[PDB]
Amino acid sequence: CTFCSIINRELEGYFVYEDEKFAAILDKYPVSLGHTLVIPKKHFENYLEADEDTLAELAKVVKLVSLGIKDAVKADGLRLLTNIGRSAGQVIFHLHVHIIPTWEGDYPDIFKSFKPRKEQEKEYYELLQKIIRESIENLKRKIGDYKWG
Amino acid sequence: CTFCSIINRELEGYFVYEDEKFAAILDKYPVSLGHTLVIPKKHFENYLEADEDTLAELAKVVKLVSLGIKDAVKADGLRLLTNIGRSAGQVIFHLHVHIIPTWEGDYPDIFKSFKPRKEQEKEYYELLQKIIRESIENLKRKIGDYKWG
Numbered sequence: 001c002t003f004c005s006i007i008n009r010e011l012e013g014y015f016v017y018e019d020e021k022f023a024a025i026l027d028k029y030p031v032s033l034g035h036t037l038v039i040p041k042k043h044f045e046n047y048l049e050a051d052e053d054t055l056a057e058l059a060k061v062v063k064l065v066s067l068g069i070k071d072a073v074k075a076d077g078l079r080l081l082t083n084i085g086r087s088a089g090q091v092i093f094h095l096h097v098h099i100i101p102t103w104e105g106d107y108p109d110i111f112k113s114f115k116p117r118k119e120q121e122k123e124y125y126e127l128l129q130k131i132i133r134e135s136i137e138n139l140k141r142k143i144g145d146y147k148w149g
Numbered sequence: 150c151t152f153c154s155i156i157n158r159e160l161e162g163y164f165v166y167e168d169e170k171f172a173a174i175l176d177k178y179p180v181s182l183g184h185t186l187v188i189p190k191k192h193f194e195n196y197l198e199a200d201e202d203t204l205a206e207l208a209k210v211v212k213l214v215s216l217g218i219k220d221a222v223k224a225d226g227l228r229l230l231t232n233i234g235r236s237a238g239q240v241i242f243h244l245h246v247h248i249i250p251t252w253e254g255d256y257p258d259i260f261k262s263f264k265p266r267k268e269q270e271k272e273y274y275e276l277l278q279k280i281i282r283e284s285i286e287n288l289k290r291k292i293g294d295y296k297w298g
């Protein structure tokens with residue numbers, strides 16, 4: 001499994017979020033700048049096979065990571081989706097939610113050339129990971145369980 | 150708001166699921182047969198504006214309704230998605246999750262002519278509502294809080 005492999009560090013992946021049961025990883029072949037996948041660490045074939053507690057916490061992680069990404073890449077919108085079955089477009093059979101950023105215009109200048117739907121240069125993953133992590137950390141400081149400003 | 154209106158019975162909508170805080174309604178201009186929208190009754194502009202408890206329960210309702218729809222229309226797959234912002238395709242600003250059925254071939258014979266992305270004839274809504282409700286009721290009987298077979 002591609003995701004179980006990334007979780008176990010057997011396959012390369014850039015984490016932007018991680019806790020004991022969940023993680024968010026940059027998509028290797030991003031549809032748009034900042035495209036990220038949020039996944040439960042435990043392996044479930046799809047959304048319908050996951051227990052309610054996992055789905056409930058997954059929804060909360062998706063919110064946090066989405067807020068973080070929107071802030072980091074200054075997105076005007078976000079598309080959230082998960083596919084169940086090959087006829088619905090599922091190709092990785094480990095439950096994951098896509099967070100695909102959108103803009104009414106063009107993405108920030110701070111970001112350089114981007115090749116939609118293809119593998120990017122190493123620099124892309126390193127920068128996106130760092131800025132997204134920075135945005136998420138701030139969200140934990142102003143709206144986290146131990147927020148203070 | 151189109152969804153608040155449907156919830157308050159001020160605007161026509163076919164419910165396939167409903168409880169004190171959530172509801173699932175057939176999409177009026179379905180992308181595919183059985184296309185349904187799951188919504189929290191309370192009004193939230195999008196996914197990011199909803200509190201964690203609402204998102205957690207929403208995820209659970211989405212699972213139940215999805216299982217029900219897949220069974221009812223004998224789908225091979227399902228696409229689940231929610232849009233945040235007009236640039237991501239959002240047009241109804243009341244948080245809702247799309248459940249769009251897919252098939253590797255064609256949908257069941259029991260179903261007649263279907264016009265993708267357009268308003269269907271009254272018969273479509275009446276039949277889909279009835280079969281989906283029937284499937285959901287069964288799910289509550291075999292895997293519900295008071296299941297027994």
Ligand SMILES: [Zn+2]
Nearest residue numbers: 001004043094
């Ligand atoms: Zn896996």
Ligand SMILES: [Zn+2]
Nearest residue numbers: 150153192243
């Ligand atoms: Zn509303």
